[PDB]
Amino acid sequence: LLPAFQNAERLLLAHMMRSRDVALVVQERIGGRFNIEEHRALAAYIYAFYEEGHEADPGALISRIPGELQPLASELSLLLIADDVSEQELEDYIRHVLNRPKWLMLKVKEQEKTEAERRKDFLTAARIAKEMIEMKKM
Amino acid sequence: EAEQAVLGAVFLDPAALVPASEILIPEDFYRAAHQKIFHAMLRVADRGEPVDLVTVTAELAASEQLEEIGGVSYLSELADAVPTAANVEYYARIVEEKSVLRRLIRTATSIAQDGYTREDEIDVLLDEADRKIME
Amino acid sequence: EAEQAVLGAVFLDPAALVPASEILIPEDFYRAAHQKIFHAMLRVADRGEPVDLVTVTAELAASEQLEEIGGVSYLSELADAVPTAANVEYYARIVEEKSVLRRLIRTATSIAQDGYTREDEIDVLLDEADRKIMEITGIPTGFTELDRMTSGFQRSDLIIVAARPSVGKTAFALNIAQNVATKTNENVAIFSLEMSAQQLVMRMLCAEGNINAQNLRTGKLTPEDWGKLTMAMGSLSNAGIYIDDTPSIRVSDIRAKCRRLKQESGLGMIVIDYLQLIQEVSEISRSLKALARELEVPVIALSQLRPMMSDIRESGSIEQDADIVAFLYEIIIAKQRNGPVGTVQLAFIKEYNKFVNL
Amino acid sequence: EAEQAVLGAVFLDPAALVPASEILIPEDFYRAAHQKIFHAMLRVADRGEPVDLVTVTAELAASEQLEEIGGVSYLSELADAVPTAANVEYYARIVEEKSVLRRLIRTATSIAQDGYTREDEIDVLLDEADRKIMEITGIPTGFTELDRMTSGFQRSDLIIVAARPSVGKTAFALNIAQNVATKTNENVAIFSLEMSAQQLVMRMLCAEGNINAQNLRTGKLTPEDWGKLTMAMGSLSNAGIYIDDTPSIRVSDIRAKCRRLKQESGLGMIVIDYLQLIQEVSEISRSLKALARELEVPVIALSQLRPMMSDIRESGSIEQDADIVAFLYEIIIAKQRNGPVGTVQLAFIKEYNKFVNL
Amino acid sequence: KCRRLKQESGLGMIVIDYLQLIQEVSEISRSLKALARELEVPVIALSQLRPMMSDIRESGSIEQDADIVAFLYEIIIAKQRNGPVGTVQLAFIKEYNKFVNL
C-alpha cells in the first residue's frame, strides 16, 4: 500500500505541480533532498518550470519532462487532493521527507546490533538497541 | 482510498477519531472490512482506552473478525501508509458523500423496482416515494 | 500483541512497569518467553537499578534464558516496535483478562475431567467444585470566590454545571457568559437549545441594568425602567456574545460553528445549553472535551439530574471527561483538577434574575 | 440398573412411588424410555387411580409412547424382575446422584465451550460461571437499647435496614460501622454504591469530633473546629474501616472482596449501601444471606421503600432471607429470629449527623 | 397542491383548516413550518384546545415550530418572534359572521 514518507513525497509533488505557490515553500525547506530518484528528477523539473516565470498548471508540466518521467508525472497530477494544503499538512509531509535519511540511518547500527549478538557480545548489542530506541523516539 | 486515509489517520493521531466519528458511522464505509474496523475503533473508544494498533487488533480479535479484515497486516498497512492526520475530516466528508450517493441510488432503485410490484397503490407508491426520498 | 505492548512499553518509560506489575504477575502472560522477560524485569526492579534494555538482557543472561526467549533481537523488537507507553495499563488489563479466561477454562475442564474419575464422591466433587470455581488564571467568572477555587475557567477544560429543574442553572451560565463578555474582551458562544434566542436576551438584559418587576414582559415601564434598559442595551450592545438557538443540534455542528468563529473574531468560552438535549451521551461528553482541547477554550456544558456525583453518572459517563463538575443547590464544585473541592455560596435575586457575590 | 429398580418397585408396592417421587423427577432418569415411564407413572398418580401395570401401560398408550419405550414387555420385564420394594429410596438416591453428575458435567462443559466464544465478556463469563455452577452477643451497634433486643448483630445473620429517602438510613448504618470500628477492634467493610468514598468520610468525621455548622464544606473553620478535626481524624485514623464506592457492583464482587479481606486482616461487618442499587433482587437477597453465612459475619443491607413489611416485600423477596428487618421512621425491628420484636427509639442530631442514645 | 399553485398563479397565504384533523402531530407541525419556509409564505394553521400555552402543548409539540401562536377568546398573541406579546381586541358581528375593527 506504500509507506508514509513515500505518500508524503508523492502528495507534495501533486500539490506543487498543481500550485506553484506551494512549490516555492517546498524549495527552501526540501532540496530535494527528496528520497526517491524519480521524485528528485521531477522536483528539479517542477522547481525550474516557474523560475521561467511560468504561470502554473500540470498540463504544462507533464509536457516537459523527458518522457520516462511522464507515465509517473501524469499519474500524480490525477492523484486525489483538495487544492489548498493545510498549514500543518505541509509541515507533516515535509517532516516525513526530511527525516527519512535518519530512519535509513538506524538500520546501519541495526546491522551492528545483530553482528554483536552473533559474537555473543550481548551487553553491547543491548546498548546499541537502547540507543535505537532513542533515535526511534525522535 | 479516502476510506484507508481515515482509518490510517486514526492509528496515527488518534484524536483523529473524534472528528471522523462526528462525520461517519461504520455504515458509511463501502468495504465491510473497514466497517468492522471503524466499528471496533469506536467500540474501543467507548471506555477506553485508548485507540491504537494493539488495542484495536485486540477488539477485532475478541469479536473475531481480525482475519476477516486483513490481518494485523492490513491494519499495519493502513497505519504505515498514512503520512499525516490533519485531513481526516476529510476524507471523512468524502466517504460520507459516497455513502449519501449509495443511499440515493438504493432508495431510488427501490422506487423503480417498487414501480412494477404494486399498482395497486400509486398513492402509497407516490407517498412512500417522497417519504423514502426525503430520508 | 497486547503482551508485546506491555513489555515493549516498559523498555520505553520505564515507569510503565509500576502499573504493569500492579495488574500482571508473570504467569498472566501466555507466552513463556514473555513470562521470563516480565519476571526478569521485576527481578531487576527489586533493587535497583533500574529497568532498561541492557539491565534486563543482563538478568536474563544471568539466569540463562536470554536465548531461550528471542535474543536481544526480540527484546529490541519489543522496544523498537511499540510507539507509546501511555497505555500499558492496558494492555495490562487485556492480558490480565485473557489470563483469567484461561484459568476459568482450566478449572472448568478440570471439573468435567474430574466428573468421570470420582463418583465415589459427588459431594466432595460438588464442593471442591465451588471451591475451585470461586478462585486567578484563567477567565473570570465575574464571581470573586468562585474565581479563587478555580482561578478561571481556563483553556482546554470542560466544565459541567448540573442542577435540578428550576434551580437556576441557565440563569447561572448566562451570568458567567455575560460577565465574561461585558467585563473582559473575549467572545462567548452560547448554544441555547431550549429557550429561544431573544427570550434569552431579556434574561440577561434584566440581569444587567437591574431591570424588571414592572415588567419588560407585561408591556409598559416607568421612566426609571426606560432610562435603564437604554444603558443596559447600550452596555450589552458592545459585548462579545454570540447566540445560537438552533432547535436541537448535533456535536459536529457545535464544533463547526465554534471553529469558524475562533479564526474570524476570537472566542474564549463555549456555553452549551443543556447536554441531555443535544443529539450515547458518553460519546458526546468525549466530543465536548475534545472540542475544549482543540479550541483552547473552556467549554461550559449545562446538565440536568441533594446533589452528588452518582446523580448524573448513572446517565452517561461525563464523570471522567469533565475536569470540573459544578452543582447548583450553594455552588458545589465536587470535582476539579486545578485543585480544591468544596462549597462556594452565592446569593440570587430573582426579580433581576442575577446571581450575586457575598 | 438402579433406574430399573425404581421403576420396578413402583409396579410392586406401589406406595413405592411416593419416596421415589420425593427424590426424583422424570428428568433424573438417563434413559428417555424411563423418563417417559416415570412421567406417566406420576401423571397417573395425579388422580388416581392408582398406579399399576395396566393403568400405566394405558397412560403411555394414551400419550402414545407405549411402543416407544419397550412394549408392555419391558414394563413387565421391569415388574417381574424386581424382587423387593423396600429399597426404592435408593436406587432413587443413586439415580438422583448420577443425575446431578450429568448436570455438573453439562454446566461445566458449557463453561469451557463458552470460554472461547465470548472474550468479549470475561466478567459476564465469570459471573454466569458462578451462577451456572451454583445451580449481649454479638457486635455492639454502639447503642445501648438496640443491643438489648438484638444482643448484636451476630455472625451469619443478614440485617436489612429499610427507610424512605432522607430519613437517615445511611447516616444510621455509618454510625454503626463507626462505633464498631473505633470502639471494638473489628474490621468493617462498607460498600457505598451511591455516595462517594470521601463524601462518606466527612459524614463520619462530622459524626465524631462533634464537628460542623461552621462548616467543613463551606471553607474556613474556627480554632475550636480545627482542634477538633485533628482528634476526630486521629481517632478515626486507627479505626478498622474499609470503603469501596465502586459505582454499582454485582454480588459476586462484594463477596470476592470481602472474602480476601477476612483472611488478610480480620472482618466483622459488611455494610452494603443500598440493595435496590446493586446489580432479581430476590436472587441477590439469597446471595447476601449466603455471604453472611460463609464469612460468619453480620451483613447489613440497607433498603429503600409508615412503615411495615409489605412495603419492601412487594419488590423482591428479602423477607424470608433476612433474619432481622429494621425500619427507620423510631427504629422498628419488625422481624428478628434472636427473639423480641418492637420499637426502639433513637435521637438524631443533624448538625453533627449523629444518631444518639436516650 | 400548494407547491404547484405557486409556480402557475402566485400564492401568498396557506390557511389550513384545523390541524388536529389532518392525517404524530409534532411531526405534522414540523412539516408545516418547513412548508412555510420552502414557499416563502405565511401558513395559518388553525388549532383546537381561558386560554394559554399548555392547553395545546400537552397535545403534540407545536410550541417550538410555530413562531406565532394566536388565541381566540380577545386575540391573544401569546408567542411571536417579530416582537411584542399581548392582547388585541376585536369586535364580532355574528349576523354577518364578521370580525371587525375597534
Residue whose entry in the numeric block shows the C-alpha cell 494498533: B53
Among A113, A122, A132, the residue with its CB nearest the CB of C61 is A122
Contact D167, D328 (CB under 8 A): yes
CA distance D120 to D109: 19
CB contact under 8 A, B77 and A92: no
CA distance E74 to E78: 12
- Give the residues after which the backbone of chain E is interrupted, taking a C-to-next-N distance over 2.5 angstroms as a break: 23, 49, 73
Hey, which residues does D162 pair with through a beta bridge?
A: D303, D327
Amino acid at position D264, single letter? E
Question: Which segments of chain A does DSSP mark as H helices, in order?
Answer: 4-18, 20-29, 37-51, 58-61, 70-77, 87-98, 103-118, 122-137
Q: Catalogue the long-range contacts made by C336-339 (C-beta closer than 8 Å, 24 or more residues apart).
A: C336/C149, C336/C150, C337/C157, C338/C149, C338/C150, C338/C151, C338/C154, C339/C149
Amino acid at position C190, single letter? I
Contact D272, D302 (CB under 8 A): yes
Sign of CA dihedral D226, D227, D228, D232: positive
DSSP 8-state assignment for residue C30 = S
Among B1, B83, B84, the residue with its CB nearest the CB of A80 is B1
What are the cell numbers at B17?
Answer: 477519531
> How do D331-336 and D269-272 pair as beta strands?
unpaired
> How do D355-356 and D347-348 pair as beta strands?
antiparallel
Q: Which of chain C's residues have a Cβ under 8 Å away from the Cβ of B22?
A: 250-252, 255, 287
D3 belongs to the catalytic site: no
What are the cell numbers at A53?
Answer: 516565470
CA distance C327 to C305: 10
CA distance D154 to D174: 18
B128: left (phi over 0), alpha (psi -120 to 50) or beta: alpha
CA distance D24 to C73: 65
CA distance C171 to C190: 13
Rounded to a whole number of angstroms, the distance from the CA of D66 to the nearest CA of chain C is: 33
Contact C174, C200 (CB under 8 A): yes
Q: How far is CA D302 from CA D21, D274, D275, D288, D341, in A?
A: 41, 5, 6, 12, 19
- Which 3-state string (H, E, C) describes C190-218? EECCCCCHHHHHHHHHCCCCCCCCCCCCC
**Strand, coil or helix: what is C331?**
strand
- Which 3-state string (H, E, C) describes D206-221? CCCCCCCCCCCCCCCC
What are the cell numbers at D227?
Answer: 482542634
Q: Is A133 on the interface with B (CB under 8 A)?
A: no
Q: Catalogue the long-range contacts made by E38-42 (C-beta closer than 8 Å, 24 or more residues apart).
A: E38/E3, E39/E2, E39/E3, E39/E6, E39/E11, E39/E14, E41/E2, E41/E6, E41/E11, E41/E12, E41/E13, E41/E14, E42/E12, E42/E13, E42/E14
Q: Which helix (H) or strand (E) holds D296?
A: none
Among A8, A80, A86, the residue with its CB nearest the CB of B83 is A8
Q: How far is CA C180 from CA C151, C269, D18, D40, D293, in A?
A: 14, 8, 85, 84, 61
Cα–Cα–Cα angle for C191, C197, C199, nearest 5°? 125
Q: Is D116 on the interface with B (CB under 8 A)?
A: no
CB contact under 8 A, C217 and E81: no
Contact D262, D254 (CB under 8 A): no
Search chain C and give the residue with CA nearest A113. Answer: C73
Half-sphere exposure of B5 (CA within 13 A, CB side): 20
**Strand, coil or helix: what is A83?**
coil
Half-sphere exposure of D186 (CA within 13 A, CB side): 20
Q: Which of chain B's residues have a Cβ under 8 Å away from the Cβ of D120?
A: 62-63
CA distance C340 to C331: 13
Q: Which of D77, D128, D145, D194 is catalytic?
A: D194
Q: Is A42 on the interface with B (CB under 8 A)?
A: no
Q: Which of chain B's residues have a Cβ under 8 Å away from the Cβ of D119?
A: 62-64
Q: Which of chain A's residues have a Cβ under 8 Å away from the Cβ of B88?
A: none
H and E: helices and strands count for chain D: 15, 10
CA distance C208 to C230: 11
Nearest to D172 by CA among D182, D181, D162: D162
CB neighbourhood size of D300 (10 A): 25
The CATH superfamily of A5-100 is DNAb Helicase; Chain A (1.10.860.10)
Touching chains, A (3+ CB pairs < 8 A) = B, C
Cβ burial of A85 (10 Å; 0-12, 13-18, 19+) is buried
Contact C188, C179 (CB under 8 A): no
Residue A100: which residues within 8 A CB-CB, separation 6 or more? A5, A35
Q: How far is CA E79 from CA C200, C321, E67, in A?
A: 14, 39, 7
**Strand, coil or helix: what is C107?**
helix
DSSP 8-state assignment for residue C277 = G
Q: Is C342 on the interface with D (CB under 8 A)?
A: yes
Cα of E98 vs its chain's centroid, Å? 19
Quoted resolution (Å) = 4.0
Q: How far is CA D347 from CA D45, D177, D182, D358, in A?
A: 62, 18, 21, 7
CB contact under 8 A, C80 and A125: no
Nearest to D303 by CA among D157, D155, D165, D189: D165
Rounded to a whole number of angstroms, the distance from the CA of D250 to the nearest CA of chain C is: 15
Burial readout D216-246 (b: 16 or more C-beta within 10 A, e: otherwise): beeeebeeebeebbeebeeebeebbbbbbbe
Contact A5, A75 (CB under 8 A): no
CB contact under 8 A, A92 and B82: no
Search chain B and give the residue with CA nearest A86. Answer: B86
Hey, which residues does C241 pair with through a beta bridge?
A: C188
Contact D161, D333 (CB under 8 A): no
Cα–Cα–Cα angle for D295, D301, D302, nearest 5°? 165
Cα of C189 vs its chain's centroid, Å? 21
Q: Is D219 on the interface with C (CB under 8 A)?
A: yes
Among A2, A80, A92, the residue with its CB nearest the CB of B84 is A92
Nearest to A38 by CA among A30, A46, A26: A46
Amino acid at position D146, single letter? L
For chain D, the straight-line distance linking the first and the last C-alpha, in angstroms and rounded, comes to 70
Q: Which of chain A's residues have a Cβ under 8 Å away from the Cβ of C57?
A: 122-123, 125-126
CA distance C262 to C259: 5
Amino acid at position C205, single letter? L
Cα of D8 vs its chain's centroid, Å? 40
Residue whose entry in the numeric block shows the C-alpha cell 456555553: C271
CB contact under 8 A, C105 and D115: yes
CB contact under 8 A, C196 and E85: no
CA distance D212 to D297: 33
Question: Which segments of C24-157 does DSSP mark as H helices, in order?
Answer: 32-45, 53-62, 72-81, 92-117, 123-133, 144-150
Q: Which of C194, C294, C319, C330 is catalytic?
A: C194
Nearest to B31 by CA among B60, B14, B7: B7
Domain chopping of chain A, boundaries? 5-100, 101-137
Nearest to B54 by CA among A135, C93, A129, D125: C93
Nearest to C179 by CA among C161, C153, C198: C153
CB contact under 8 A, C198 and E86: no
Residue whose entry in the numeric block shows the C-alpha cell 470461586: C134
Half-sphere exposure of C350 (CA within 13 A, CB side): 2
Cβ burial of C79 (10 Å; 0-12, 13-18, 19+) is buried
Contact D186, D180 (CB under 8 A): yes
> C-D interface: how many C-beta pairs under 8 angstroms?
74
Search chain B and give the residue with CA nearest C290. Answer: B18
CB neighbourhood size of C334 (10 A): 19
CB neighbourhood size of D96 (10 A): 21
Nearest to C5 by CA among C27, C29, C32, C25: C29
**Strand, coil or helix: what is B114?**
helix
What are the cell numbers at D310?
Answer: 409489605
Q: Which helix (H) or strand (E) holds B90?
A: none
Whether chains E and D touch (3+ CB pairs under 8 A) is answered by no
CA distance C252 to C270: 14
Q: How far is CA D276 from CA D3, D160, D162, D318, in A?
A: 46, 12, 11, 11
As a residue count, chain C comes to: 358
Q: Which CATH number applies to A101-137?
A: 6.10.140.360
Half-sphere exposure of D73 (CA within 13 A, CB side): 4
What are the cell numbers at C292?
Answer: 475544549
Interface test with E, best of C192, C194, C195, C196 (most E CBs within 10 A): C196
Q: DSSP labels for E43-99?
A: EEE-------THHHHTSS--TTT-SEEEEE--EEEEEESSS--EEE--EE-SSS--E
Contact A26, A12 (CB under 8 A): yes
Q: Is D195 on the interface with C (CB under 8 A)?
A: yes
CB neighbourhood size of C121 (10 A): 13
CA distance D307 to D329: 7
Q: How far is CA C345 from CA C148, C333, D220, in A?
A: 13, 11, 13
What are the cell numbers at D90?
Answer: 435408593
Sign of CA dihedral C114, C118, C119, C124: negative
Nearest to D208 by CA among D183, D233, D190: D233
Q: Work out the widest C-alpha separation in chain A, in whole angstroms.
A: 63
**Which technique?**
X-ray
Contact D295, D289 (CB under 8 A): no
Rounded to a whole number of angstroms, the distance from the CA of C81 to the nearest CA of chain B is: 11
CB contact under 8 A, C84 and B18: no
Domains of chain B listed by start with CATH number: 1-134 (1.10.860.10)
- Which 3-state string (H, E, C) describes D198-259? HHHHHHHHCCCCCCCCCCCCCCCCCHHHHHHHHHHHHHHCCCCEEEECCCCCCHHHHHHHHH
